[model samples]
Target: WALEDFEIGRPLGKGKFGNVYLAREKNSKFILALKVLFKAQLEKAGVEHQLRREVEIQSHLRHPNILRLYGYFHDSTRVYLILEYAPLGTVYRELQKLSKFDEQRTATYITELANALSYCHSKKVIHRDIKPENLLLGSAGELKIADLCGTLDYLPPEMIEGRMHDEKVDLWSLGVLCYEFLVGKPPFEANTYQDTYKRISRVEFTFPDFVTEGARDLISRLLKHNPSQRPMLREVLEHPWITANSS
Candidate 1:
């Protein structure tokens, strides 16, 4: 559809390069989030290629746990993306409010994420980034992997060490995400960014007494220092903690 086809509503949120709005297609009254990006800013930041790549990757993803990118359009000064709207908002906000989640909720989210990651890997698409902020909560209580933008706290060792990596980077991120979900903080959070980097590099982390042994086992397997030793996404789905209280 064209730009004129959407009746834009209030701003949903803002990002580094754009703002998202709640919108409805005038013809079908279909609801979707419209992400409006400034071409000037994209060009200035040299992220035009990145935007293209993101659109390319997201548009092809069809998993229920991954947000859908319907299509895109552009004008002289702006680019617009048609995306699935998640009325429940971001998982980050939910995490902030709740501090942490119970085992069942965490396990359910992990199972969905693992299945999504497995699907992406099978399609030869590496999500590279996986964190609470990059996830959205659907109205149906589903978790949707939202974007590819990553943060240093979620960076895998291979990426930090400037070594070759693959889909396993996502597994490492999943491990970190799992830790944060249950503990209320990332495993390697430190006073300073440098210290945080050091902790990540050294794989320094400790589980709280409250964490279950099964959960610890899964985290340890995913957070292995060697990427090759990390469990595959499918294995993560089958892990005891994920299956424990799952129906």
Candidate 2:
């Protein structure tokens, strides 16, 4: 549906290319998120392939943690992607609701995210974007990954340094997400973007001492400077923190 079809009470965040509108079908009042994307912008950015991949990958993915792409329609100017909106908004906002996750809460969230990542990797569709802003929570408290920026900021050093890579990039983002989840901020955060890139290139970062050794171990292994040194998705799921019984 377009902006005209949306009701006034519902609010959705907007981006440069388009705006998200929370709309309800007139008959059933069934709510859905309608993303309005400017066709000209996609073509201008040469992201038609990425947009197509997003639609293709999301349509084929059936996991509960992945955002559901119901369908799409395009006219002469713009395309609309109908989706299941996570009412809790982005995980970045959700994390702000708490100062930091306690051990139990952190474990639960990590386990859930790992399961989702494992399933995605099995299908050979790398999320490529795993930051808190991209992670959302459904009405039922399930985590859903959103946005397909395609590694704009989360790309690993090898990929940034002119090495070709693929799904492994998602693993690196996962490691960054893990560190962010544990520390309440990204590992490479700096006063300037250049400094952040430098830190990432050098892999210059450390985990808080308060972070549990098991959790730190997993993060360290995943954040290895060499992508090949990082554990595979399956191994990450089976990692001690994921499989361990925390009391």
Query: TM-score: which candidate is best?
Result: 1
- What are the TM-scores, per candidate, against the unseen true structure? 0.96, 0.87
Q: How close is candidate 1 to the true structure, as a TM-score?
A: 0.96
Model-by-model lDDT, in order?
A: 0.89, 0.77
Write one digit per residue (lDDT tens) for candidate 2, span 6-34.
45345577787788888775666778888
Clashing pairs in 1: none
For candidate 1, lDDT tens digit of each residue in 62-120? 99999999999999999999999998998889999999988898999999898888888
* Candidate 2 stretches greater than 4 Å from native: 1-9, 148-153, 245-247
Q: How accurate is candidate 1 locally (lDDT)?
A: 0.89
Clashes of each: 0, 0
